[PDB]
Write a protein that binds this DNA or RNA. Structure first.
Ligand SMILES: [Zn+2]
Length: 252
DNA sequence: AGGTAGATCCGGAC
DNA sequence: GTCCGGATCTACC
């Protein structure tokens, strides 16, 4: 899921688990657990804590418990659900948190790409995976100025810059391509080649694009179809190592 | 010193 | 087999 969906999960999941106390933690794919490295220590420390809140930073969900924070990333296909311990488990369930009330928070992920880190709360923001996370795209801390500073100092493409989690938090591939199209900027453009007028326009389109979503598509996945604004066929290439879509006529 | 590219994980799809 | 992907983490200057 992308940032908008993660924000929806955060909002909808909180009420389904707030106030429940963990009685057991079962792990069926140890590799999801990144800290503590030992999945048995991860399970043991969570036992007995009550869920007090659920926040989001970028695409990471931060579960707040009594003493610890559990930081989770669903990557492309992870998903959470709350259900009864009496019912059979859905396929690909790799981590289950069993609550004292007989309900469970289940983590499912066909690809097994997601990650979980648990740290004492006061420490989570200073450790991986949250440590060097950049500003939320919809916050005043993400400004044209901040984008300009980062763009000027690198030799990488504008796309590579926007995908960098230390530049802006959790702005995905789809939003990068749609934002560049709305701003009229080619994805393969060196970040340092953007003018301040372009940087400002890029910043505004990033905010409206992700803002509209959190609250169809022009180019993402529309390879070979006509551009919705000019009819020119949308092209797809590899930029910054990822599938990249753009209109050759409208983006410069 | 520290940017930055390359490697990495995993299992559907084509 | 091959491709693909977020955010590390490793290694090359
Ligand atoms: Zn166009």
């Amino acid at each position: 899921p992308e940032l908008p969906e993660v924000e929806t999960i955060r909002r909808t999941l909180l009420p389904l688990i707030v106030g429940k106390t963990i009685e057991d933690v079962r792990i069926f794919w140890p590799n999801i657990i990144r800290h503590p490295r030992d999945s048995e220590a991860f399970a043991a420390r969570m036992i007995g804590q009550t869920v007090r809140g659920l926040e989001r930073r970028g695409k990471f969900l931060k579960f707040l418990l009594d003493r610890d924070a559990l930081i989770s990333h669903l990557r492309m296909e992870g998903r959470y659900a709350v259900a009864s311990a009496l019912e059979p488990l859905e396929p690909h369930t790799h981590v289950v948190f069993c609550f004292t009330d007989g309900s469970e928070l289940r983590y499912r992920d066909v690809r097994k790409f997601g990650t979980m880190h648990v740290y004492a709360k006061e420490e989570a923001d200073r450790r991986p995976p949250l440590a060097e996370l950049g500003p939320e795209p919809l916050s005043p801390a993400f400004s044209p100025a901040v984008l300009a500073e980062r763009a000027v100092k690198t030799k990488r493409s504008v796309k590579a810059l926007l995908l960098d989690c230390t530049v802006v938090a959790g702005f995905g591939n789809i939003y990068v391509d749609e934002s560049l199209f709305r701003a009229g900027i080619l994805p393969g453009r060196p970040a340092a080649s953007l003018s301040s007028k372009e940087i400002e326009r890029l910043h505004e389109e990033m905010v409206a694009t992700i803002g509209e979503a959190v609250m169809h598509l022009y180019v993402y996945g529309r390879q070979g179809n006509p551009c919705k604004r000019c009819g020119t066929p949308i092209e797809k290439t590899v930029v910054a190592g990822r599938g990249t879509h753009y209109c050759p006529r409208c983006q410069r």
